[PDB]
Amino acid sequence: LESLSNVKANSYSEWITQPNVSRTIARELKSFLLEYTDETGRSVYGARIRTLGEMNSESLEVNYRHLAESKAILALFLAKCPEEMLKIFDLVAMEATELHYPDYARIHSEIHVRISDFPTIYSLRELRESNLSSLVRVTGVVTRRTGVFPQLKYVKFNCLKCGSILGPFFQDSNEEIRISFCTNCKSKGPFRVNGEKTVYRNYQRVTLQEAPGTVPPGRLPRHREVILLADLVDVSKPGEEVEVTGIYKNNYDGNLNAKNGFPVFATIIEANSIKRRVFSWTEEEEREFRKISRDRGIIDKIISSMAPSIYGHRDIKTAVACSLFGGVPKNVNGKHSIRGDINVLLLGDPGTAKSQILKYVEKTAHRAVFATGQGASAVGLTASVRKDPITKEWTLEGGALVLADKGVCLIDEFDKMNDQDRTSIHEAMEQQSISISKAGIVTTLQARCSIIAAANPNGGRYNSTLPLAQNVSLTEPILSRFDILCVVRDLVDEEADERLATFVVDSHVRSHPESPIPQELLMKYIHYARTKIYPKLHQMDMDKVSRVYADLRRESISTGSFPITVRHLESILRIAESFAKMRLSEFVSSYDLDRAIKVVVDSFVDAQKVSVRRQLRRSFAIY
Amino acid sequence: VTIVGIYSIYNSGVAIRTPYIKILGIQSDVETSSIWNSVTMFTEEEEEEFLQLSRNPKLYEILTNSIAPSIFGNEDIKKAIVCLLMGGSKKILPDGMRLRGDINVLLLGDPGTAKSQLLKFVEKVSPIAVYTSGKGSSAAGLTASVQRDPMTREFYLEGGAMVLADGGVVCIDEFDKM
Amino acid sequence: ERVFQISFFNLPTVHRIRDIRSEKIGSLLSISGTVTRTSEVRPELYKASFTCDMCRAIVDNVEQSFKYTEPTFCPNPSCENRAFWTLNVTRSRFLDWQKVRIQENANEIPTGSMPRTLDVILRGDSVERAKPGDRCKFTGVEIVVPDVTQLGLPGVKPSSTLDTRGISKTLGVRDLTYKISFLACHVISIGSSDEINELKEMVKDEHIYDKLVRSIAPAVFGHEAVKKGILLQMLGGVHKSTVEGIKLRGDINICVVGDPSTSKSQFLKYVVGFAPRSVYTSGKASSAAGLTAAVVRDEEGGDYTIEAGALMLADNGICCIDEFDKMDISDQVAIHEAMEQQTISIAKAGIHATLNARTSILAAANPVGGRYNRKLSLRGNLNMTAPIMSRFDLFFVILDDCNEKIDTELASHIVDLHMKRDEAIEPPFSAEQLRRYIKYARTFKPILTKEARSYLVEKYKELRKDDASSYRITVRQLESMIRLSEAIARANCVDEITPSFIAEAYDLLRQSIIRVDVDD
Amino acid sequence: PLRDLDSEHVSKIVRLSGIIISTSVLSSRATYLSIMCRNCRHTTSITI
Ligand SMILES: Nc1ncnc2c1ncn2[C@@H]1O[C@H](COP(=O)(O)OP(=O)(O)OP(=O)(O)O)[C@@H](O)[C@H]1O
Ligand SMILES: Nc1ncnc2c1ncn2[C@@H]1O[C@H](COP(=O)(O)OP(=O)(O)O)[C@@H](O)[C@H]1O
Ligand SMILES: [Mg+2]
Ligand SMILES: [Mg+2]
């Protein structure tokens, strides 16, 4: 035959499987792979198989537009009965790889085929009984996920009469296969599969749910089950919208038809291709990082890139950057631990863009976890032992503090926590580790994380006439583990109102239908800086630091304020380390020390009562 | 732990099997040293070394200097900690009464005097030690707790730092809140 | 090959679910009810094909008739097979199949009794036509299906056994318990034309706003501000999306505060009786699953399904909540989750899902102490929590003032209503007219103007300066003012917000804040 | 990693790290059995 397939003998499935037409279509698919070329004249598929061989891959992606344009008839019969043509084109791809590469079967016995660019897009609610055993393309969100399981591929059997091991028999992924004849014995007795001589592949089940935005008002989202085989497993984790191309078919096995009631069937989708509807770098990016670092005034370059969707609050943003870069931990002889994570506290009046700051930090950090003292959240703060609903096994789970080891833990509504949450937070901050004694398990988990918190004052309004300790429900042991306290007051002013109101109204009008470093580069900059920079100190700044500390101590004791203690010196050193890290330098300059001094002194002064505050403003005017 | 074994399957989709591991070796990283897993045998070299160290005329000074050399001052506190770690001598009497031999110490002070780092060092340096606060820890009580077994539905000691640290030292922070 | 379906409709009479009798089994009638649940559409075995075993003969197009049926004899004398067959799932046909659960109408439930439910089966092209929370009129056949649950009931239950007289010699007994179901063929919901002329005439009025305000809750005396809130709650703002993924709300929420001796509940009753998709619920007669949603995993034929709650119903509508001050903490958190993100996350029985909850909330709250202490502020007189309290963009506190003319006028109105009944209402517009107007006007999406931005900024400055009362002012009130202004512009059927509407919105917002009285 | 185990490792030797969360009670299995026939009293043995 030669492009005479437009003649129809009987139903499409029967036609496609005849040996002669099978050979015809196989040869024509091989010619499609070997000959297809675009206008540029480059061998798109040639390069595809070349890179497949170079990378030692297992699958080739194919475009439906090219195949349609070239061989409309083959494209149509593919859309109708793809089950057989998957096998046919798998064999074609195997022979193509053999032609390009020698003895590829030595490593991989199969090359899978992935289709792409299918013209029609469906929703999970549109599938009906005219789509069964056909090719579909849908989209939705991932809601659950099973583990990876092994499935039989090349089964070998044991004869119980003679110990012969019958040779491999292919498993088709349709129904379990059996054998009945032993060649040596000429027998038919019992058989058992050989576990140690069988080859398996990967199996995974995924449940897809529609995107809530697309559901027309008044109805509810639908869902389906998806099957992922081989190297499609562990590609789409829960919580991401994806596009899946597969074959829509029933559970023809079912359970049995003796069941009472109407004879109805369940259906699944066998995925052929999956796609999604980073913090790594390279030398190309490393050179640009170093170039940007060398420029003067890089700290203020970075600070202006924090939370672009908020106006003002420069102190908040510099503190956020400092806690987002971090210092260097230390340990002397392995018997005296010093922490390197900088904690900040946001204490402001209602309507001051605190939750937005936390959301930005969550969206910009490499490992950020969101919790709260009130409301629904994906995780709590305490460790516990709970059943797994789907696997039905006991599991050990830590809180957001354990989960964010070497990261940042964000807590919203810090003033509304209960006793258990307070105890967990206190232990994590004091010891950087969480204990547990539950259900026969005694252990300790690491809790070395950075904390950014937001709260409200008593009564919802700040009383500037009293010290900070009497404006919040928190206690001294917890409040003293922070080193950057930020106080936001909604004082009424005219120019500020103009600026904020114009910002807000412009924002809204832009979003009606009808200097700063780029963020995508900033993420990689932060990751690289944390990964590769460990600044040190020079003993020549000891005199300056000691003199400043003595001045602060003397003034604090004279004015009868909250005591200045060595914790502030350690915070100053940590912030200086972070500022040095911001520049990619290996040493801490005097300018970083000055910036840290300003930050800590301003934080300390801003948290006192009005009289003490104004007295301390004059004394420390140098900074 | 670190485990070496064989990745295998068994029969409990269409052709699915359940994986599991056949253990060939176990390597433990040393966890939760308690009174039930102590070692009461000493090598002869260690014994001779310790006897030699005992005779040092300046042993008390060296031991005092060893406790947290990274903190300044508080010589009396450190000597108290030496006496605490060593412990007294217990006496059992013919009538049944017990005269304890352990030592209790309290630390009143202002914020930022390095009295939590001393507790942390004592925790890190004692053979058996639990460091906790009043109200216990996250998902870990401060005193003995009795719970019913999830499957057999019967009593056992669920936990409690006070009994877990039997034969050791318990470090309590924020003693005024409980 | 083609499957043909007939569709009867417009029967002379309609039956209630409470008046179905086993006499009309197998006949065509019409019923009505409210839909409670719907399942997914699944293939249904219609004409099966089998392969004989003793011989390789093939049998095609075997009818099922409501149950899984097998061929009764080999079609050829070459084989004498019977009862030994295999099913071919590769050359058979299927039809779409759905199951729907309906409930009695509220006004049809007799005295002292709980409502009934009835299963309804849909086929073919009728599937996916009903919707939960809607009232539909069905037409089809009344049928019977097995009921294994009827064992244990009192009485004698028919049994069947094979007659053994006339059989040469030298156990299959069956039970005949059934229940009544309904297989329907036509379903229609029950709630342009010449009326475009009427619509154009009425929009071309000049004082249309005053009539629109007066026609809301005509049976309640006074309280114009609450009416102007209920209006502008039916008509809402526009939902906006930022480039970075920040979504801006378009819904307006209201809370009416008063003691049990006031008439705040009548507003909620009017809204639920009038608004298209509205649900009424009480603070203490509700539950967490009653709100939000539940999961019913015992789907007798296959996988699970979800059953909508109160918030799920009235999506893109209005939810009324009386006795709002008796909600617990968990339900308050659920309402706050709905208000913050227009979604409801359901996690039960190892099943996760997400559900839209884009709703506007109309709440009525009592003062904490029974009487509104005017010496305290709004926060000190309520029991709510700060998160939910900060999302209510209007607080209407209604109080009682003694005055001769007011009292006599109110008494005259009430006596008129009792004596005259329907006669003494005379509103400018009727409910159908308001519904048509609101349906038309909800599709305009007004926009701001260059002149309006600075005027709005100056109004916000004025309001902030004057604030420096019931509660302080923040930017949240600026967003609320924008929302209200655009809602008013929609209400006036204009494509651009003008400073007049901005002034109207500002005055409405300002008048709703009351002052705290102090001694001396 | 525990999440990196897959089909290619079946029946091979692996090295894994993690935390123990549950140990069971001791069971009993046979290593040598002596058996007898209840009809003719023929006896034999089995080794595991
Ligand atoms: N300075 C500001 N600049 C821009 N938008 C702001 C600013 N302050 C508040 N907003 C906006 O006003 C609203 C305030 O809500 P948000 O949750 O951010 O406040 P918050 O300070 O966390 O208050 P709370 O949680 O106590 O209600 C949000 O829309 C926020 O975007
Ligand atoms: N006398 C001291 N000598 C050395 N370091 C000190 C001293 N006092 C405080 N510090 C520093 O303060 C930290 C301990 O503070 P902290 O344990 O919070 O004290 P407290 O428990 O009394 O509040 C240590 O990291 C240490 O570097
Ligand atoms: Mg907030
Ligand atoms: Mg301390």
Ligand SMILES: [Zn+2]
């Ligand atoms: Zn054999």
Ligand SMILES: [Zn+2]
């Ligand atoms: Zn036959």
Ligand SMILES: [Zn+2]
């Ligand atoms: Zn025998």
